[PDB]
Design an enzyme around this catalytic site. Structure first.
Site, PDB file in Angstrom:
ATOM      1  N   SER A  55       0.832  -1.190   0.000  1.00 34.92           N
ATOM      2  CA  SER A  55       0.000   0.000   0.000  1.00 34.92           C
ATOM      3  C   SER A  55       0.857   1.227   0.000  1.00 34.92           C
ATOM      4  O   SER A  55       1.876   1.289   0.711  1.00 34.92           O
ATOM      5  CB  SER A  55      -0.917   0.138   1.245  1.00 34.92           C
ATOM      6  OG  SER A  55      -1.987  -0.761   1.104  1.00 34.92           O
ATOM      7  N   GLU A  62      -1.658  19.272  -4.502  1.00 40.56           N
ATOM      8  CA  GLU A  62      -2.991  19.505  -3.977  1.00 40.56           C
ATOM      9  C   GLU A  62      -3.791  18.243  -3.977  1.00 40.56           C
ATOM     10  O   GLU A  62      -4.996  18.354  -3.808  1.00 40.56           O
ATOM     11  CB  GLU A  62      -3.749  20.494  -4.904  1.00 40.56           C
ATOM     12  CG  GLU A  62      -3.080  21.850  -5.032  1.00 40.56           C
ATOM     13  CD  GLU A  62      -4.071  22.815  -5.687  1.00 40.56           C
ATOM     14  OE1 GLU A  62      -4.782  23.520  -4.912  1.00 40.56           O
ATOM     15  OE2 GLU A  62      -4.050  22.836  -6.912  1.00 40.56           O
ATOM     16  N   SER A  63      -3.181  17.066  -4.206  1.00 45.44           N
ATOM     17  CA  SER A  63      -3.959  15.830  -4.321  1.00 45.44           C
ATOM     18  C   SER A  63      -3.051  14.621  -4.201  1.00 45.44           C
ATOM     19  O   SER A  63      -2.038  14.752  -3.476  1.00 45.44           O
ATOM     20  CB  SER A  63      -4.760  15.923  -5.600  1.00 45.44           C
ATOM     21  OG  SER A  63      -3.952  16.143  -6.732  1.00 45.44           O
ATOM     22  N   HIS A  68      -2.936   0.139  -3.928  1.00 48.34           N
ATOM     23  CA  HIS A  68      -3.128  -0.914  -2.929  1.00 48.34           C
ATOM     24  C   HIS A  68      -3.150  -2.225  -3.702  1.00 48.34           C
ATOM     25  O   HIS A  68      -3.979  -2.371  -4.612  1.00 48.34           O
ATOM     26  CB  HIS A  68      -4.391  -0.692  -2.096  1.00 48.34           C
ATOM     27  CG  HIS A  68      -4.338   0.659  -1.454  1.00 48.34           C
ATOM     28  ND1 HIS A  68      -3.525   0.867  -0.369  1.00 48.34           N
ATOM     29  CD2 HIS A  68      -4.904   1.853  -1.783  1.00 48.34           C
ATOM     30  CE1 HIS A  68      -3.657   2.149  -0.042  1.00 48.34           C
ATOM     31  NE2 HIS A  68      -4.497   2.791  -0.874  1.00 48.34           N
ATOM     32  N   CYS A  83      -4.213  17.844 -10.171  1.00 50.81           N
ATOM     33  CA  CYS A  83      -4.802  19.172 -10.345  1.00 50.81           C
ATOM     34  C   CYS A  83      -3.982  20.060 -11.251  1.00 50.81           C
ATOM     35  O   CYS A  83      -2.738  20.050 -11.282  1.00 50.81           O
ATOM     36  CB  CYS A  83      -5.017  19.876  -8.976  1.00 50.81           C
ATOM     37  SG  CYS A  83      -6.151  18.950  -7.896  1.00 50.81           S
TER      38      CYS A  83
END
Lengths: 118, 120
Positions: A55, A62-63, A68, A83
């Site tokens: 994981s 910003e993101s 996983h 973004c």
């Protein structure tokens, strides 16, 4: 651009199971995926699930990019949320597709923060 | 019938001071993980420019994330949980309350559907 960000929710099937269980390689490929997209990495953190599975999260401006894995099923859950006009999450997709050797993929592209909603 | 459940949430018209408070967002995101029943692996929270918070709570084999835009009252929230006794909707409820969102849009994905992977 009609939104703050673009978010790919990807299902990767029939991947190379050795790669899916390799915490170092997955981290390396995720950072390269981020580079390919144009994104800037703020931090990254990757963990070995036991007995099998990797994981990881790559935090960008910003993101985020996340993965996983379920080596026992050949499956990875990937999210590529970027973004800005400068950053192309499909470039990260392509890198990971090739790095994981997925034989089948499903991807949905969401808008995050549509301009007409915010 | 899937390995995980994933809420992709748009929160609108939130409390803008909350959205720009990195300490409070970290606390509320950790609380949200607790409400869901998830086990925290690691947590990392960042506030960087002139506003806006990004946070991730890595949980056993998935994640809870938040990215805020205080100037718009908007937060992008993702609640991806795995296994039957972890409920991402309890995280949702906590965060809806904490952020004082007046409007929400949520997609629930099945990540790793058993019929797609080939699991009985």
């Amino acid at each position: 651009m009609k939104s703050l960000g673009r978010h790919l929710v990807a299902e990767f099937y029939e991947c190379d199971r050795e790669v899916l269980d390799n915490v170092q390689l997955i981290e390396q490929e995720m950072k390269q995926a981020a580079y390919e997209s144009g994104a800037t990495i703020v931090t990254s953190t990757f963990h070995r699930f036991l007995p099998y599975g990797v994981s990881g999260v790559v935090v960008i401006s910003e993101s985020h990019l996340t993965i996983h894995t379920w080596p026992e099923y050949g499956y990875a859950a990937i999210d590529l949320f970027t973004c800005g006009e400068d950053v192309d999450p499909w470039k990260a997709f392509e890198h990971l597709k090739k790095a994981l050797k997925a034989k089948r993929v499903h991807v949905v592209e969401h808008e995050r923060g549509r301009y007409d909603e915010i």
